[PDB]
Design a protein around this ligand. Sequence first.
Ligand code: MG
Lengths: 9, 304
Amino acid sequence: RAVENQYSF
Amino acid sequence: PGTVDKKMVEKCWKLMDKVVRLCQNPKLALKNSPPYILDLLPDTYQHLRTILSRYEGKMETLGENEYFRVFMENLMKKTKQTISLFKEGKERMYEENSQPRRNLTKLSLIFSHMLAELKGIFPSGLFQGDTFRITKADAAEFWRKAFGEKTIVPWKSFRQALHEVHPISSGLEAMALKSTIDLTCNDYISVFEFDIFTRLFQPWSSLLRNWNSLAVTHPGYMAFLTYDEVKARLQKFIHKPGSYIFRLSCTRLGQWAIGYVTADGNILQTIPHNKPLFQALIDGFREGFYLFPDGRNQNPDLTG
Ligand SMILES: [Mg+2]
């Protein structure tokens, strides 16, 4: 299953 | 396209199963990150099951729906294209940076946009494209005035309608526009794709001028690129903080994802909020974060 991509803020 | 019958849906499922099998090949080394074809196809199957599920008996109605016919035709077409890519690409499918491999990634993105569109038109499995909510008021008015409650229209038809309100400068610009808006690459424009485009390039009042400045002439724009491709592309600029590029977010369809190299050696990607790309880019420049589009020394001046 896919792991969400690491976005930042 | 022709009417959709149970048989056809079966054929698509079988073709999807084969794509899944091919993509499980260890040589591919596919990362489990959005867009992940190994999730997308099974998830598409599941939602198609749900749709059929809620159209028990009243299948004739489902089969005649224009959007659904276009969608199923495209699904079958894209799955076959993917299978062909593998056989014609042969051993080159495993050589990263090869065209055949890049094509698989683009298809993965397309499958992602297709699943999102399907769920947006068939939320809970029941057709609701006729009541779809276009996010920007101005865009919404344009669509109902020109296409009423239609869910999908041919590109030619869309182009001509838009042209009357936002003149398209040329054939080449028209083609660029089409490739930007036609997320499902099926030569049609759904109310869903229309919504995404108009939200990304708002305000509607200067729609095409916005698109021209942010994508047609902007070196930072990356059409059909994934999160992993953006990170990979910025690697060569790891020692050049301020280098940045941007693209459509794949999991937050309708929003932007900006990738950039920080002064401390990290490559981050952020999704702007409460501010159109225009302001995000301008503020980012001033704060020293978005200085070099695709690593280039000159940055477009959008403050105009
Ligand atoms: Mg389309």
